[PDB]
Design an enzyme around this catalytic site. Sequence first.
Site, mmCIF file in Angstrom:
data_model
loop_
_atom_site.group_PDB
_atom_site.id
_atom_site.type_symbol
_atom_site.label_atom_id
_atom_site.label_comp_id
_atom_site.label_asym_id
_atom_site.label_seq_id
_atom_site.Cartn_x
_atom_site.Cartn_y
_atom_site.Cartn_z
ATOM 1 C CG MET A 215 -79.773 21.360 -105.649
ATOM 2 S SD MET A 215 -78.796 19.781 -106.154
ATOM 3 C CE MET A 215 -79.530 19.593 -108.250
ATOM 4 C CB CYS A 216 -81.674 25.029 -101.812
ATOM 5 S SG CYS A 216 -83.607 25.230 -102.204
ATOM 6 C CE1 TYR A 217 -80.096 22.733 -96.736
ATOM 7 C CE2 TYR A 217 -80.711 24.401 -96.937
ATOM 8 C CZ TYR A 217 -79.771 24.065 -96.366
ATOM 9 O OH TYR A 217 -78.631 24.711 -95.859
ATOM 10 C CB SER B 172 -83.144 28.838 -100.016
ATOM 11 O OG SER B 172 -82.137 27.801 -100.148
ATOM 12 C CG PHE C 169 -78.569 16.668 -102.421
ATOM 13 C CD1 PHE C 169 -77.694 16.697 -103.413
ATOM 14 C CD2 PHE C 169 -78.239 16.512 -101.161
ATOM 15 C CE1 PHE C 169 -76.727 15.607 -103.276
ATOM 16 C CE2 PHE C 169 -77.755 15.120 -101.117
ATOM 17 C CZ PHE C 169 -76.677 14.664 -102.097
#
Length: 108
Positions: free
Chosen positions: A64-66, A70, A93
């Site tokens: 998990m990223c923003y 990424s 997220f």
Amino acid sequence: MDQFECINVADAHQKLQEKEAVLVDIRDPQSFAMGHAVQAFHLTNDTLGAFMRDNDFDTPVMVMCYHGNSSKGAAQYLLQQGYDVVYSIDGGFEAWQRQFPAEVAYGA
């Protein structure tokens, strides 16, 4: 296998609940502390060495990223290191918090 897969947060949540996969969060530490999914491990280049010692290459890993961007490159990187089962979580997220607001933890 030699490719990673994109999954949505409902799928990721189910895998987590079933104890089928581990969850890593590759965001910056300040954003991580402001709120992250329950049970997420904060994975950075510095924590990678520990992560690898602690999670065998056959461990399914969800990244998990923003926003889901990424995490694709990070997932591919993990495959290159030897992980066989790696996912990137679409929406990041933001999507997790929208769908599962009661499953957000703060701090490290």
